[PDB]
């Protein structure tokens, strides 16, 4: 990687959630890169227990809209619905790695979108069963998360000032 490139300052910290978008169409090659990032993500046992359902045509976007009650949601040009396949995900305890593995793919895709100058927001506040009904999703697959993305409106600042807990609050060394 470049000599002076810092992942934190130059890349992670420059990404804020974007909920307000302009009309500029997203280039095909940029959408394909985002999807490639998801495809190459690691997973437990490399089972890749995900499927990416892209919704960007008007009919599909309109169908998806009723799954959310957040006013900003229907304004996103592109949605990537990340489906987790319980039949394919590694088992642990009485559950599985669907939430873990899909979230790695979502993180890769979010970061890839950011690297290509797009804005996005990760969405989990939606009616999953309704999503499954509308898109004929098999019972054994769950829509876990949706990446809502497009070109951000540059006149709209981040929703609030950046805030996180202190490093002293979130880290313990050796013992809690």
Ligand X SMILES: Cc1cc2nc3c(=O)[nH]c(=O)nc-3n(C[C@H](O)[C@H](O)[C@H](O)COP(=O)(O)O)c2cc1C
Residue set of the binding site for FMN: 15-17, 19, 70, 72, 124-125, 159, 164
CB atoms within 10 A of CB 46: 8
- φ, ψ for residue 78, nearest 5 deg: -130, 140
Residue 138 CB, shortest distance to ligand X, in Å, is 23
Shortest spacing between CB 3 and ligand X, in angstroms:
26
Q: Which does 137 bind (CB under 5 to 8 A by kind): ligand X, a second copy, none?
A: a second copy
In the structure encoding, which two tokens stand for residue 121, read together? 């927001």
CA of residue 19 relative to chain centroid, distance = 13
Tokens of 100: 């873990």
DSSP 8-class letter at 12: I
Rounded Cα gap, residues 151 and 133, in angstroms: 29
- Residue of the chain from 16, 51, 56, 63 that contacts ligand X (CB under 6 A): 16
Stretch of 20-28, 31-39, 44-52, 136-144 lying at the interface with ligand X (CB under 6 A): 44-52
User: Which of 43, 82, 102, 142 is the binder for ligand X (CB under 6 A)?
Assistant: 43
Q: Which does 35 bind (CB under 5 to 8 A by kind): a second copy, ligand X, none?
A: a second copy
CB 114 within 8 A of CB 14: yes
What Cα–Cα distance (Å) separates residue 10 from each residue in 15, 86, 114, 159? 9, 36, 11, 21
Phi, psi dihedral angles at 51 (to 5 degrees) = -150, 135
Q: Which residues bind a second copy (CB under 8 A)?
A: 1-2, 5-8, 10-13, 17, 32-33, 35-40, 42, 44, 46, 48, 50-57, 59-60, 90, 92-93, 97, 99-104, 106-108, 111-112, 115, 122, 124-125, 128, 135-137, 144-145, 163-165, 167, 170-176
Q: Which residues bind ligand X (CB under 6 A)?
A: 16-17, 19, 42-46, 70, 97, 100-101, 104, 121-125, 158
């Amino acid at each position: 990687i470049p000599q002076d490139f810092r992942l934190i300052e130059d890349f992670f910290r420059t990404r804020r959630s974007v909920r307000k978008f302009i009309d500029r169409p997203v280039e095909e090659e940029k959408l394909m890169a985002i999807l490639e990032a998801g495809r190459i993500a690691p997973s437990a046992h490399n089972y890749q227990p995900w499927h990416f359902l892209v919704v960007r045509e008007e009919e599909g976007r309109k169908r998806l809209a009723p799954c959310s009650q957040q006013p900003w949601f229907p304004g996103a040009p592109i949605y990537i619905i990340t489906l987790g396949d319980h039949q394919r995900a590694w088992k642990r305890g009485a559950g599985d790695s669907v939430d873990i593995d899909t979230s790695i793919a979502m993180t890769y895709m979010m970061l890839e979108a950011h690297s290509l100058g797009l804005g996005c927001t990760w969405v989990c506040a939606f009616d999953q069963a309704l999503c499954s009904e509308i898109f004929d999703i098999p019972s054994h697959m769950t829509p876990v998360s949706i990446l809502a993305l497009g070109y951000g409106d540059p006149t709209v600042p981040p929703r609030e000032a950046f805030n996180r807990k202190t490093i002293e609050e979130v880290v313990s060394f050796e013992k809690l």
